[PDB]
Curated annotation (Swiss-Prot), chain B:
<comment type="similarity">
    <text>Belongs to the ryanodine receptor (TC 1.A.3.1) family. RYR1 subfamily.</text>
</comment>
<comment type="function">
    <text>Cytosolic calcium-activated calcium channel that mediates the release of Ca(2+) from the sarcoplasmic reticulum into the cytosol and thereby plays a key role in triggering muscle contraction following depolarization of T-tubules. Repeated very high-level exercise increases the open probability of the channel and leads to Ca(2+) leaking into the cytoplasm. Can also mediate the release of Ca(2+) from intracellular stores in neurons, and may thereby promote prolonged Ca(2+) signaling in the brain. Required for normal embryonic development of muscle fibers and skeletal muscle.</text>
</comment>
<comment type="subunit">
    <text>Homotetramer. Can also form heterotetramers with RYR2. Identified in a complex composed of RYR1, PDE4D, PKA, FKBP1A and protein phosphatase 1 (PP1). Repeated very high-level exercise decreases interaction with PDE4D and protein phosphatase 1 (PP1). Interacts with CALM; CALM with bound calcium inhibits the RYR1 channel activity. Interacts with S100A1. Interacts with FKBP1A; this stabilizes the closed conformation of the channel. Interacts with CACNA1S; interaction with CACNA1S is important for activation of the RYR1 channel. Interacts with CACNB1.</text>
</comment>
<feature type="domain" description="MIR 2">
    <location>
        <begin position="4"/>
        <end position="48"/>
    </location>
</feature>
<protein>
    <recommendedName>
        <fullName>Ryanodine receptor 1</fullName>
    </recommendedName>
</protein>
From Swiss-Prot, chain C:
<comment type="function">
    <text>Cytosolic calcium-activated calcium channel that mediates the release of Ca(2+) from the sarcoplasmic reticulum into the cytosol and thereby plays a key role in triggering muscle contraction following depolarization of T-tubules. Repeated very high-level exercise increases the open probability of the channel and leads to Ca(2+) leaking into the cytoplasm. Can also mediate the release of Ca(2+) from intracellular stores in neurons, and may thereby promote prolonged Ca(2+) signaling in the brain. Required for normal embryonic development of muscle fibers and skeletal muscle.</text>
</comment>
<comment type="similarity">
    <text>Belongs to the ryanodine receptor (TC 1.A.3.1) family. RYR1 subfamily.</text>
</comment>
<feature type="modified residue" description="Phosphoserine">
    <location>
        <position position="352"/>
    </location>
</feature>
<comment type="subunit">
    <text>Homotetramer. Can also form heterotetramers with RYR2. Identified in a complex composed of RYR1, PDE4D, PKA, FKBP1A and protein phosphatase 1 (PP1). Repeated very high-level exercise decreases interaction with PDE4D and protein phosphatase 1 (PP1). Interacts with CALM; CALM with bound calcium inhibits the RYR1 channel activity. Interacts with S100A1. Interacts with FKBP1A; this stabilizes the closed conformation of the channel. Interacts with CACNA1S; interaction with CACNA1S is important for activation of the RYR1 channel. Interacts with CACNB1.</text>
</comment>
<protein>
    <recommendedName>
        <fullName>Ryanodine receptor 1</fullName>
    </recommendedName>
</protein>
Curated annotation (Swiss-Prot), chain E:
<comment type="function">
    <text>Has the potential to contribute to the immunosuppressive and toxic effects of FK506 and rapamycin. PPIases accelerate the folding of proteins. It catalyzes the cis-trans isomerization of proline imidic peptide bonds in oligopeptides.</text>
</comment>
<dbReference type="GO" id="GO:0010881">
    <property type="term" value="P:regulation of cardiac muscle contraction by regulation of the release of sequestered calcium ion"/>
</dbReference>
<feature type="domain" description="PPIase FKBP-type">
    <location>
        <begin position="19"/>
        <end position="107"/>
    </location>
</feature>
<dbReference type="GO" id="GO:0060314">
    <property type="term" value="P:regulation of ryanodine-sensitive calcium-release channel activity"/>
</dbReference>
<protein>
    <recommendedName>
        <fullName>Peptidyl-prolyl cis-trans isomerase FKBP1B</fullName>
        <ecNumber>5.2.1.8</ecNumber>
    </recommendedName>
</protein>
<dbReference type="InterPro" id="IPR050689">
    <property type="entry name" value="FKBP-type_PPIase"/>
</dbReference>
<dbReference type="GO" id="GO:0010880">
    <property type="term" value="P:regulation of release of sequestered calcium ion into cytosol by sarcoplasmic reticulum"/>
</dbReference>
Amino acid sequence: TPLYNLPTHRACNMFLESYKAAWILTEDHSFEDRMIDDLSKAGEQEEEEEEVEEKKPDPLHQLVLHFSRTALTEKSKLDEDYLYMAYADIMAKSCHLEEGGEEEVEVSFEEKEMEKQRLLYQQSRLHTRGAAEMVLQMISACKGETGAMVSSTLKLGISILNGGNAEVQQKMLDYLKDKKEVGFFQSIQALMQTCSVLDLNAFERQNKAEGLGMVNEDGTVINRQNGEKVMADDEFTQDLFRFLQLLCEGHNNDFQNYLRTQTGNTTTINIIICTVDYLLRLQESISDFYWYYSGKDVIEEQGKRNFSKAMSVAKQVFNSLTEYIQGPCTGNQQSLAHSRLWDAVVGFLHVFAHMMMKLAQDSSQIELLKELLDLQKD
Amino acid sequence: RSEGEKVRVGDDLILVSVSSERYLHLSTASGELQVDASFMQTLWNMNP
Amino acid sequence: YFCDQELQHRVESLAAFAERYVDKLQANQRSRYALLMRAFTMSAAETARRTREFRSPPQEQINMLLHFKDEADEEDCPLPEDIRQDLQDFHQDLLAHCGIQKKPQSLQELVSHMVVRWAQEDYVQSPELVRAMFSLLHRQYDGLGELLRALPRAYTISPSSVEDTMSLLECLGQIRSLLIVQMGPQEENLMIQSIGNIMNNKVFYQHPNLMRALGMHETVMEVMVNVLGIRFPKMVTSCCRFLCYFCRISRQNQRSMFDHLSYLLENSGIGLGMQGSTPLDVAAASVIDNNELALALQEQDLEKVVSYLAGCGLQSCPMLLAKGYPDIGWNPCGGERYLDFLRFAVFVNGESVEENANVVVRLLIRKPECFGPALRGEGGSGLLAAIEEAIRISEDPARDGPNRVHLGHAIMSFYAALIDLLGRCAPEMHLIQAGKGEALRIRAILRSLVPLDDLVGIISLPLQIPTLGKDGALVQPKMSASFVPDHKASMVLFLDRVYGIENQDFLLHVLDVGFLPDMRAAASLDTATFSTTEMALALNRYLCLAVLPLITKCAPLFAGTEHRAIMVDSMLHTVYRLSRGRSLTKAQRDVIEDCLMALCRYIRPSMLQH
Amino acid sequence: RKGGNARRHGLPGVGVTTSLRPPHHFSPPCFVAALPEAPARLS
Amino acid sequence: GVEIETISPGDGRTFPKKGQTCVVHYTGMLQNGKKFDSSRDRNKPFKFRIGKQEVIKGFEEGAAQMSLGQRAKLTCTPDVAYGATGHPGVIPPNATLIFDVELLNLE
């Protein structure tokens, strides 16, 4: 048990593992902005040929073109590669500088507008170089295969579309309407159907597993347990519906009508109705979770965390459903009126009508109650 | 038809027991055409 | 290559600092340990030491000691200032070497400026070149992340094992070499030899973390993808020989192999690995004796195996009818393989996992054709009828034979596995007392499925005791072809699990029918001529495992037994006879003796006079 | 060794490497030998 | 059996005995005139024990029969080994051999 009687080599292995997890991992370093800037500088090509138009692409442009080429190649599935994973991560963290900014007191209108200008510039640095098309191409190429590839593509698309800027929306709409492809929307439908909900079976299994607490080879605490089985890919499904929201943000009626029906293509996929269906599934899962805790006096810590995950995802779904109709698009308003939205709303009303009292009868659940009321507001 | 979908008038469905976890089955081997909770799944029509 | 050598130099330097630093850390831990044993009167400091540098896993100990990079954390840490500053200096020079911080000065600036200049000069059109320059550019710019990705593969070993790991790496060398080559005869033989040597290597056992870091389980799995994706039965026989032993090596290895459980059950077939080792076997070896993996086992895998079990129950084994055995219409052998896997999934550490048991019984009961001709209304036969027809099959060699495979034995071993699975899916005693609705209903389903009279009948048919035959010789029955006491043990497991023994009249009836004859057979075979007989050993372990351990917990029921007193007398006479140790394991004998004492403390002394 | 030469990387590939590598095996080409399942032929 | 014919005389006095690893460099051909195995081209002489017959048997006999410093052409009849099912890729299964081997610095 003392570390001294352990073998020297094994002690070195423990030191290396814990040093990796405690110093290098936490040692953050920003290079995305510098490296994207260096790739975006065109060099001396314009100096050698001012009078020549249609010049060679910038290094960043060539990079994005390469990824577009691998995306548009014909293949059964998109094989995972860390090259594009790393580069899409870099290109997202370049634009996210103004997203985070780099207790919330008032900000000057000048400062807020200039932050929007910085974000617009950093988004232009990528969407004037084909990134807006490349995210569409890779989403269509993944064909609804959930994985780190579609995750990185969605995160990049959110990074470009943050703030609902209209240039990228226009480029995306023009690309889809011209290529006439159905792979992109079929892929979106498939991913949304493979999004998960509150299971209530993996919950019991994970609760019993964490209550087990045996000593494995990894130590007294089982670090090799499946971390979150009850709500996996929560961050993925939040990013997916965030992407669908940012397509129609700014009340872009053309993209809103495109999401409802895509005239011109041979097959139409009603993303609005599909979103309503996912919402209905989430509503039923939340109702089942509430029934599971209906008899219990106090919801324990794992139950509070799982309600937080499900309710945050429901907040994102509600925001995207709102953004599909905030601009007065009569088509989507009628589609939601005739859809199964009313059943989902009635279920959510019942869940809130009982969950509010259930949490209000206790003080330690005040944070969960605040989040619940926020969801009801949405 | 998927689980979580509304059932309409004149829809065929499989009634599975909660007590015995057994289907509602039409046993006609006896020739009296009896009903029993057995595992040969049997469709049913629920007409208002 | 030069960037790769820079990275290799960095990780090697990190290992060198690791070995320099562990000595200092152990020395400081020695000084604090000596101080703790010198003065431990202060309870607060003693408990703090007993949590930090005592009674904790070494990983947690080193993590807590090494957690000082932040100043607030470093305010209260057991490390000294000299060792602290040494590590901070090393972290600073690691950042300097990674470049964390005209004319190029270092390799990083050189490659970065070179690649950008190449891209600016002209529009490159060779895709391999494009990804080459951008891969190098990403590696140069993000140096720390490359080290982060490299450290999982980094391992440190003692010098005394160096030669053994060199043989290790050589064997893995040809496994990777003929990974890309199509399988042939001499290729197969070469990799059988490499798996044999990979057994022989001692570092295989004494370093499982480096086993994972090298990841030869991934390599051999992909070799499986070749052969399985029917061909090379020797290869399929050598699959479990290494994979399953790798599972047994450590718990984390079993986790790693569990990550691939979907694929093994995806191609799980009786025609795959027909002899000895099997993909079925590696699937089960990934779940043996691990509650966490049993719980994490998702239910669609159980869907796969129940569908395959139904497939076996639908039609007789194609391999068997190719051998020419009589057409049964339902496969016993493959069904019993699948039932063994299901038992390993459901049951663990002498306990029944409730959720696994629930989904297993729900799927099995959902597909009624899984149980076979017996236990189905269309079949119109029960477990009793199944054992009678199975014994007749074993009796006549016309239908038993078509040579080592015997249809009657396979049939009743299949039904024994089915009953053992149901008993291992039986709910727990404390759950049934607390009144869990699902547990009560699962026990009700088992009660409806398996009628009690069938169980007592199957216990009541006895064994075939070995006979002398010719003088000076001992002719023994063929256990591999006939009914063995292992079927009895699995049968009475259902009795002690689902129904229980709560009635004294039922208890004495059970001992009268098929239990006391077994103990009389034990007393008859207690002679040294029949002591080492294999049937006698099977009956012996049957006793010590299933018969008398039931009797120990049925001992309070034995109080007040005046009627049929001489039957209890004969029972205790045979208990004494096997209490005398003749070809008995110490644990077996101790089980018999404890059963005898538990009986003696409830039977009347006025009864015990014989 | 130049005093101010510190904080400069050593040249890649000039240092001492200790990572365990399986050494290369080559069998010299001989054909006049009496050639006699078979062991893995070397390059 | 081989037909050994001397090319250039050597010592003619020290012949290899049974139990000695001799070093020879050679240029082996087929009956057509076919340079395929040339230790001179490879710049690496070849060593062989007499008695173990690690070398082809006809070459072993002719090498025992020649002397140090002397070269001879050994006309090897196909009854020398791999005379049927020969070494793959170099020699067709049934064919003759010749070896203009000289012995140098007999061990």
